[PDB]
Design a protein around this ligand. Structure first.
Ligand SMILES: [K+]
Lengths: 323, 323
């Protein structure tokens, strides 16, 4: 009756998955194999590696792990053992929008895992520093500046997540813009994000309004893409109150894009949605809300109701109705 | 069709499981709740914590994660939200042989996870240092000396694993000693381990023989408990050849206790067995062998055959037959 003990053992070693995968991305194993067009032997794979000579044995023991994770395949072809890609590894190949290689390099950076070791000090009072600041002795801004590459990759990461979010929005939720002729994108900075809407719906005038902050505009609809999960309840309701007055009684609305935590859910992203919240707490200081918490914010903002639409992304869409 | 992408996302964040669990052990959440005898509210649990005041919100968000991991329970009792222990958390309670709290504190120590960030340099040649030495700038011996507590816990850990191994051995595999009247425990140091055999089978004379090493004896059977996974093939076969000559043609045998890697296995410990091998490679420099590799060692030692017995432990038992 030891499946119980095994769950826990596997939870203890959950980091081994992260870090084996990290090495596979670092060594770019999946691309190399796909770019090869045919499954590669140990020595063939070895010779494609950045530096030489390679420790075949270490490479073999890591492959065995990747293969057991079911990300890579091991197959006997002729008298040779050849390694291919199991289906999940398509996200380990370059040259398509869902490539996760950057995400991986970022998330599994030793320094970016570091703050997760201060979960206990997050809970016990010592302090006002973020777990990040406690583990690295600087704030992220500073950190990113002193690590411009990590920063560049990180920005490209965020830019790419916005394309994917925006794209699922216009494609999956286009009906949400029916009747709309103007939209204000709050926190849309440059306007790259809203531009997806202007492009898909040329009949809609898209305005960006960033909020002053320390280091309104009228429309049929207001949009907030991943804004609110940064603001606490006070700010969220105020902004949500400004938005009410900015959109028309007759049909106006606010479209919110953010994670909806639902722990009682069997959706595959449930776990990751939870993880993003602890990550929020460790780094930014925001949180991800449950539907009940969204309900209450909206209710406390004087709104009539809301409708949640699920999309092919971590985040969800909340159409919040002011009148 | 995104279960594929979710596996990978969950693999990326596999470390979050390790580190949330780490905080739960650090805060000793499970014991406290069990010692309370009844499920506790946030504030009740908070007041039992080492230092004060506690960040209720951080504690709540970590609990939610633990509860989603199905280690803890969340239940509404009266008008209060109360947290209990899901079955896997029994291993998070003190006072029984299978308590895993020490294991957890050890394995999830930031410094002991550190070497897993050097998997890529394990593969690429720079160097002769262990991943451990590369991440901490010292060897373990030194390290342990400068961290006597971590060392004490670690030793107690190894001592406890030997009790459990030995105990499963005499209880599950007692028939393996039938007919045996003498046994030599190679690498049994003090003799604590073999003493389990002397105690269970008083009719057996138990000798310890440690091997000289830098910083034989005759018996019906020889025993090697977790010796061989440290020696490479050369040494393994030599030792296995000495053992042949030390035990009788008529029934003599060598009993090996060590992990048998079997990647094509649905046994719950398969993953962890793999993980222990990468851990070996990162720290000690040994490896864990597949049955085929054991077969070949034994075959190359001139043995007739072997029999594998599975026991309730990570390791397995190989009776290797010399004649
Ligand atoms: K780490």
């Amino acid at each position: 009756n030891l499946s119980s003990q095994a769950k826990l053992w596997n939870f203890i070693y959950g980091f081994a998955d992260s870090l084996v995968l990290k090495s596979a991305v670092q060594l770019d194993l999946a691309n190399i194999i796909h770019n090869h067009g045919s499954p590669m032997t140990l020595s063939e794979l070895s010779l494609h590696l950045p530096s030489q000579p390679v420790n075949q044995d270490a490479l073999y023991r890591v492959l065995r792990y990747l293969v057991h994770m079911k990300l890579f395949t091991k197959s006997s072809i002729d008298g040779e053992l050849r390694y291919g890609l199991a289906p999940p590894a398509k996200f380990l190949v370059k040259g398509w929008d869902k490539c996760m290689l950057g995400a991986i390099l970022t998330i599994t950076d030793k320094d970016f895992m570091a703050p997760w070791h201060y979960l206990k000090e997050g809970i016990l009072n010592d302090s006002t520093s973020t777990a990040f600041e406690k583990a690295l002795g600087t704030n992220i801004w500073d950190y990113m500046a002193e690590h411009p590459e990590k920063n560049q990759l990180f920005n490209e990461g965020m830019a790419n997540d916005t394309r994917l979010i925006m794209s699922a929005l216009v494609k999956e939720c286009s009906s949400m813009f029916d009747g709309i002729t103007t939209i204000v994108d709050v926190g849309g900075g440059t306007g790259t994000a809203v531009r997806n809407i202007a492009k898909a719906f040329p009949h809609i005038k898209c305005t960006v309004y960033d909020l002053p902050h320390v280091i309104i505009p009228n429309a049929d609809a207001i949009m907030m893409k991943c804004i609110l999960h940064d603001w606490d309840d006070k700010e969220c309701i105020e902004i949500l109150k400004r938005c009410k007055d900015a959109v028309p009684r007759d049909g106006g609305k606010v479209i919110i894009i953010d994670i909806i935590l639902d722990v009682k859910s069997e959706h595959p992203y449930t776990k990751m949605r939870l993880t993003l919240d602890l990550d929020m707490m460790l780094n930014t200081g925001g949180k991800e809300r449950t539907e009940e918490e969204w309900k209450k914010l909206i209710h406390d903002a004087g709104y009539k109701g809301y409708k949640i639409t699920h999309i092919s992304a971590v985040q969800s869409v909340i159409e919040a109705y002011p009148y």
